Amino acid sequence: GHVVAQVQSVDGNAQCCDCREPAPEWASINLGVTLCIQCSGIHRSLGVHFSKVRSLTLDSWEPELVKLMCELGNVIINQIYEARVEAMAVKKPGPSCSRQEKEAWIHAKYVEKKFLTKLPEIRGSLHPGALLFRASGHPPSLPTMADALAHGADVNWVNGGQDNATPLIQATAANSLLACEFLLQNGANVNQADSAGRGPLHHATILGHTGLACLFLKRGADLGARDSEGRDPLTIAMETANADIVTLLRLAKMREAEAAQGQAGDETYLDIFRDFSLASD
């Protein structure tokens, strides 16, 4: 039971993010926090837009998402979402508080955004989107990205008149598995292209980042998307003499012809090949 031990072991993650209940076994994977049984239940009623609930012990976890949880966690997220509690003189619910008290708090905290600072801060500003963009880039600041997202930064922010890049494309150029995963968990469009028609998969291929290319493929990046030059990701991989991304893309296309006919997709596949390569990712 390595994942629950590992995620709990992050300082401050051994109590519920919302009521401090000890040894929480649930988590929100877009927020990056651990939660008790009661508060996880309340998170489900918010909607996937606000919170995606998973069990630390009962559900499977991809390694990169485990790493992401360890780079965020309760203390970091509460610095953002509970920033003004002390100055507002309000009472965070304790473990034995009622369901309704915790419902009220959680809703105030994550939906109403009652306890937020007015502007986001650089935790490692009038423009949350732009901050998100900048914090996603090399070197990425995950706490600052979370602060920007909390203050309404659009995950798919476009850097207008200025390449039209997105936080995801910026995280790709950073070769950051962690920032990409954070953005993807918070609704980034895996296929959104810059103004030259280059999506995240195009960028991962151009930059020779195998792991990122593999991640984008696993999240439904479109294999056949052509950029302004008419290049699809396979053309770029070939032109750049990159044997590993060639074979990923080529296997992705097979997996699709098997998903189209149905049904033989099963034991990714794309993963065991990504490991053998460790190529830029």
| DSSP per position, 136-191 | HSSSP-HHHHHHHHHTT--TT---TTTT---HHHHHHHTT-HHHHHHHHHTT--TT
Q: How many other CB atoms sit within 10 Å of the CB of residue 76? A: 22
Pick the closer one to Zn ion by CB: 36 or 179.
Answer: 36
Residues that bind Zn ion (CB under 5 A): 16, 18-19, 21, 36, 39
As beta bridge partners, residue 53 has 28
Pick the closer one to Zn ion by CB: 92 or 226.
Answer: 92
Shortest Å, Cβ 35 to Zn ion = 6
Shortest Å, Cβ 39 to Zn ion = 3
Pick the closer one to Zn ion by CB: 7 or 236.
Answer: 7
Shortest Å, Cβ 247 to Zn ion = 46
Of 1, 59, 68, 49, which Cα lies nearest the Cα of 26? 59
Question: How many Å apart are CA 228 and CA 162, to the nearest integer?
Answer: 17
Shortest Å, Cβ 20 to Zn ion = 7
Q: CB within 8 A of 43, min separation 6: which ones?
A: 28, 35, 50, 51, 53, 106
Q: Report yes or no: 195 and 229 within 8 Å, Cβ to Cβ.
A: no
Pick the closer one to Zn ion by CB: 18 or 281.
Answer: 18
Shortest Å, Cβ 179 to Zn ion = 28
Tokens for 27, please give them.
């988590």
DSSP 59: S
Tokens for 109, please give them.
């905290």
Shortest Å, Cβ 30 to Zn ion = 17
Shortest Å, Cβ 91 to Zn ion = 15
Pick the closer one to Zn ion by CB: 39 or 188.
Answer: 39
Pick the closer one to Zn ion by CB: 79 or 189.
Answer: 79
Pick the closer one to Zn ion by CB: 63 or 95.
Answer: 95
Measure Cα distances from 98 to 81, 89, 94, 105, 174 in Å: 21, 20, 9, 11, 45
Tokens for 276, please give them.
């053998």
